[model samples]
Target chain A: CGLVASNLNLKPGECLRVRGEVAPDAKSFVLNLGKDSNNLCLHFNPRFNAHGDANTIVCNSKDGGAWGTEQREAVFPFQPGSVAEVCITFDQANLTVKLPDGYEFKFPNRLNLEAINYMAADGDFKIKCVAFD
Target chain B: CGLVASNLNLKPGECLRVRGEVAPDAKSFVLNLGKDSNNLCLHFNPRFNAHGDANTIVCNSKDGGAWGTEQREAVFPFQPGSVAEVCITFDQANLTVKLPDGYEFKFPNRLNLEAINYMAADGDFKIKCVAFD
Candidate 1:
């Protein structure tokens, strides 16, 4: 479900694994990594038929509700009504995301945080499980 | 539920919070912190009319089925059928537990690990939420 986990401890050099099922009629889904609700360091959004992008992964950040520029990664490996696994690792500079299809995408850590303690999700996906190592 | 969360990341100085409801006909409950099931750095068990002790909290550790010496804390703040919150913080040497009633209990980190990645619970308690800071 949305807002899957919080009060987490995600330090540098650790990998976070999220497993979930995409709704069959999904339009979009978002995975947010942040210090709190108002300050998002990484807002990872995947759109299937929304935000003027189909099968595009958009990445961005926001500080105190002020959003930064958006970056897009054009890898589509998701299927509706199926389980998906996303693994993410980050440091002070960049975040490396491993998609379900075994491909990796890189996103800039614009907020440049040493560690993240919160994780949330919204929209068409239902989080089944979450883990970090 | 038992084995509420896994693949977690807990480091030194971070406090872990567990909130849950105790069963009405509760006999006992256990909270385990360790690298895995086979090795436990801290095994916290609270007994109510069980284990030859009523209203007692038992602490111990085990490595590969070999249990260490048992330690007991006489303070009991738990009641059957009520929500309880337990917070734990640790270093390499000792773990400091804050009970539901705002009192503190100390237990040695027998395995002396810097971090724990697994948490599990058994018997008479249902975990409602888990978080760390």
Candidate 2:
């Protein structure tokens, strides 16, 4: 699991708007919310592969550097080399995500806190802009 | 009908984000997609007065300073002094709008252009930020 560093003070109902594009023939990319690379409140990963991994979004949370159970979604609305917008907001117990194609889903905030102060993004993609407004 | 001009230059599927708060005891506000004050491709108006009028959203387009068919949506998702984030995206023939309360609607773009280069806002509200990226 690769990690990137971010400083975002995210509270319930507030959002982080991430805009970027996947590299052609990308393996995967991940966006993490937490205090650091080790402790994460939400781990969002999207993978594109063939061996039963054709189009999937994998999610997990890390507490005290330990990983939780992995959850997966079957929707894959990504296209390599095309721009994508990922809008994520937190509310008490769940993380609501709006994908590029307006696809939305909610994920459990296992390590829930008053706010997730850090965010990180890594893997095969080119980030255009990340808004914390 | 007040007008809000935008410099968004919106291409098909591209978005223009308008973020702000409604005034306390607000009358209304308007968001316009156009080349200038007189020429508009889409006019989004939200009226809150209940003088024999339930809450509603009115959308229209103007070419050569004349209005087109006025479409109304009977949902009023705005509250006095409430913060809002309006998401608008343009397609070949329609404008997709996402309201702050997660309300979604589509209106026709009668002037139908590949891009809406200008946008403006005026009425009763505070614009925190208008993002075109």
Candidate 3:
């Protein structure tokens, strides 16, 4: 098995967008950025069974080395078999993630964003496409 | 053990300040961004006991499914029981985090900033205070 480490040389103040489809049965999906082995990350998990109940978005740094903050009980509807487009934008200091329905979650940039340039997806889902716009 | 997950509803363009003391025997400390269980994250782990070595900051999206860019070996100083303050900023499209001495890490926003409202601390250390400005 080969591990893909893609590099996206981003400036101090630049935006990188990632748009893709969530796995039909995907309980959660995660995105990471930084360099090759070290980076900052975000986790997206939707609860289909629990409707009206807010889904969860877990954020962590250094692979569980230190967990910063969390956004509990938020409305992020994730429908099964439906294609959802999630956007992650970086403007140097802060990071904003938008759901397909315009719902957003913002947080502070904890790591060196300039060295961010790798993307990976893990779950029981297929990423139709992921682009950095 | 009780898990600490505090909420912080952030605006479109805002920054979060997390300052605390690291454990004298801490191997690494991780900082998370966004909502609980579902958010963008930036991990910081200093290679202590390993002098003049670059630490690791792992960034991830979701949990493990989708991983973003990574920053390989970066210079970060971490002394035992030393006071270190980490800053995370969100500016709509971009997010930047500054180290105590001005080292920075940037990433894109993946979730809604307005709905971000939580903060949690985990590990074998004690935190002084975590404020949002």
Candidate of highest DockQ? 1
How many backbone clashes does every candidate have? 1, 10, 110
**Model 3 alpha-carbon miss at residue A102, Å:** 47
Model 1 chain A: weakest 10-residue lDDT segment is A1-10
- Best model per lDDT: 1
Chain B fold agreement for model 3, TM-score: 0.73
- Per-model DockQ: 0.04, 0.02, 0.02
TM-score of 3: 0.42
Q: What C-alpha lDDT, on a 0 to 100 scale, does residue A75 get in candidate 3?
A: 64
Stretches off by above 4 angstroms in model 2 are A1-5, A50-52, B1-133
Q: Which residue pairs show collisions in model 2?
A: B4-B120, B4-B121, B5-B119, B5-B120, B5-B121, B6-B118, B6-B119, B6-B120, B7-B119, B9-B117
For each candidate, give its TM-score against the true structure. 0.54, 0.49, 0.42
Cα-based lDDT for every prediction: 0.81, 0.74, 0.53
Quality of model 3 by C-alpha lDDT = 0.53
State candidate 3's DockQ: 0.02
Ranked by TM-score, the better of candidates 1 and 3 is 1
lDDT score at residue B80, model 2, on the 0-100 scale: 77
What is the C-alpha lDDT profile of model 3 across B48-133, one tens digit per residue?
Answer: 53335435554544434355665544656545687777677776666676777667876666554564454444553345434455
